[PDB]
Design an enzyme around this catalytic site. Structure first.
Site, short mmCIF file in Angstrom:
data_model
loop_
_atom_site.label_atom_id
_atom_site.label_comp_id
_atom_site.label_asym_id
_atom_site.label_seq_id
_atom_site.Cartn_x
_atom_site.Cartn_y
_atom_site.Cartn_z
N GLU A 108 -12.21 -7.05 -4.05
CA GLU A 108 -12.54 -8.41 -4.49
C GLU A 108 -14.03 -8.55 -4.86
OE1 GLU A 108 -11.06 -11.43 -1.69
OE2 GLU A 108 -8.92 -10.93 -2.08
N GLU A 124 -2.62 -7.82 -2.43
CA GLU A 124 -2.59 -8.80 -1.34
C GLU A 124 -1.80 -10.02 -1.80
OE1 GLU A 124 -6.39 -9.98 0.15
OE2 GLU A 124 -7.18 -7.89 0.14
C1 LIG Z 1 -11.19 -18.28 -0.83
C2 LIG Z 1 -10.58 -16.90 -0.88
C3 LIG Z 1 -10.29 -16.49 -2.33
C4 LIG Z 1 -11.59 -15.98 -0.23
P1 LIG Z 1 -11.35 -15.85 1.54
O1 LIG Z 1 -11.20 -17.25 2.14
O2 LIG Z 1 -10.07 -15.06 1.73
O3 LIG Z 1 -12.61 -15.12 2.05
#
Ligand code: A1L0T
Ligand code: NA
Length: 387
Positions: free
Chosen positions: A179, A278
């Protein structure tokens, strides 16, 4: 050519979230035992100091995962395990609070996965300076990856990881970075150079290993024309319904429709294999600490001034045995729909295997509860998404 045929075979996986990269919502007890300021692995290790950090984290590395986890994964019809690891496992930088010792456990995972007949996807989940500002990068707040020497340090870590693992057929694929947050300020041009370098590293050690690239939160199909190479280059898109106001407002029928639409409009538009690396069974952001320890939830109006849809006490903690038959039924409907939609493209990898009790997020729980199917033929409801 490829250790696993991502072009023509479906991935059916789970993630070992929270194991070698700790996350507050996955193991709240470990963070809460070091107090209010322990909100990510960086702050946790810093608060404990090096000796106590190694003691507490190593206790968790050992206890959280055994060979029996992997056998249960194989029994559930899975063929892959995605395993997060932080850069710091390959050597903390000078001044980092992080402790290492994770590699001994990742080594065991590869052995255990092999014994159970599973492939491993090694996921470099946290980079120097943070690629996303999320707690699960190691350090929440700012994005300082791409500043200073952070990218070179990331490649140094990646190289060691590749050298360590890519001699094993069990390791079918390796992911460049979890990510990378393009909307958050990661520069795509520089990200693509990092991707190019990662691909070179993998090809130094084992050209048979697939390279996995996250879409950086851009539409996965937007990456068309970048490293398009059949089974060799796999995109990873993460699909959740609780981090966007539109999705979180949906009822079960609408959730299911949105899954199918995502498959048809996005997964099927990519010129590469795409794993949904995920996704989960939950449809709210109620799980304790999910938006970060000390942050609330959209669902009950305690995050970002969103307007409450409902209360979070039922879905914040505990195990799905606490819910009603109907609640488990609806959760299974949503899971079946995702399995079938995501198998239209290249398959799926559920987040996550195991928690301290986060309803809908814990595959080990859902399996035992009869909520998670154990094969493509194991369906209690009609197929919801079709070719
Ligand atoms: C808001 C999301 C896309 C990131 P996290 O809340 O899983 O860190
Ligand atoms: Na839910």
């Amino acid at each position: 050519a490829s250790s696993f045929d991502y072009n023509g075979e479906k991935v059916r996986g789970v993630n070992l979230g929270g194991w070698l990269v700790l996350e507050p919502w996955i193991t709240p007890s470990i963070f809460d035992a070091a107090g209010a300021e322990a909100v990510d692995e960086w702050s946790l290790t810093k608060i404990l100091g090096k000796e106590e950090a190694e003691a507490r984290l190593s206790a968790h590395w050992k206890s959280f995962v055994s060979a029996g986890d992997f056998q249960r994964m194989a029994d559930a019809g899975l063929n892959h395990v995605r395993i997060p690891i932080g850069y710091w496992a390959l050597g903390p930088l000078e001044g980092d609070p992080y402790v290492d010792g994770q590699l001994e456990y990742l080594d065991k995972a590869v052995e255990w996965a092999g014994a159970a007949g599973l492939k491993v996807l090694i996921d470099l989940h946290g980079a120097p300076g943070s690629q996303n500002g999320f707690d699960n990068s190691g350090r929440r707040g700012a994005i300082q990856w791409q500043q200073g020497d952070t990218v070179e340090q990331t490649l140094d870590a990646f190289d060691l990881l590749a050298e360590r693992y890519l001699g094993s057929d069990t390791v079918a694929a390796i992911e460049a970075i979890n990510e990378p947050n393009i909307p958050g300020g990661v520069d795509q041009g520089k990200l693509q150079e990092y991707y190019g370098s990662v691909y070179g590293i993998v090809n130094k050690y084992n050209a048979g290993t697939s390279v996995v690239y996250g879409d950086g939160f851009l539409p996965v199909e937007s990456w068309n024309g970048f490293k398009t190479e059949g089974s060799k280059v796999v995109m990873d898109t993460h699909h959740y319904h609780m981090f966007d106001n539109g999705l979180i407002a949906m009822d079960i029928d609408s959730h299911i429709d949105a899954v199918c639409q995502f498959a048809h409009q996005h997964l099927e538009a990519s010129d590469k294999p795409v794993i949904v690396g995920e996704w989960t069974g939950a449809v709210t952001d109620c799980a304790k600490y999910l938006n970060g320890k000390g942050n609330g939830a959209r669902y009950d109006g305690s995050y970002a001034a969103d307007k409450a849809i409902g209360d979070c006490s039922s879905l914040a903690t505990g195990f799905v045995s606490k819910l009603s038959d109907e609640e488990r039924s609806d959760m299974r409907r949503f899971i079946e729909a995702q399995l079938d939609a995501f198998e239209l493209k290249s398959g799926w990898v559920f987040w996550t295997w195991k928690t301290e009790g986060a309803p809908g997020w814990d595959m080990s729980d859902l399996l035992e509860a009869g909520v998670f199917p154990t094969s493509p033929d194991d369906r209690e409801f009609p197929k919801q998404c079709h070719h």
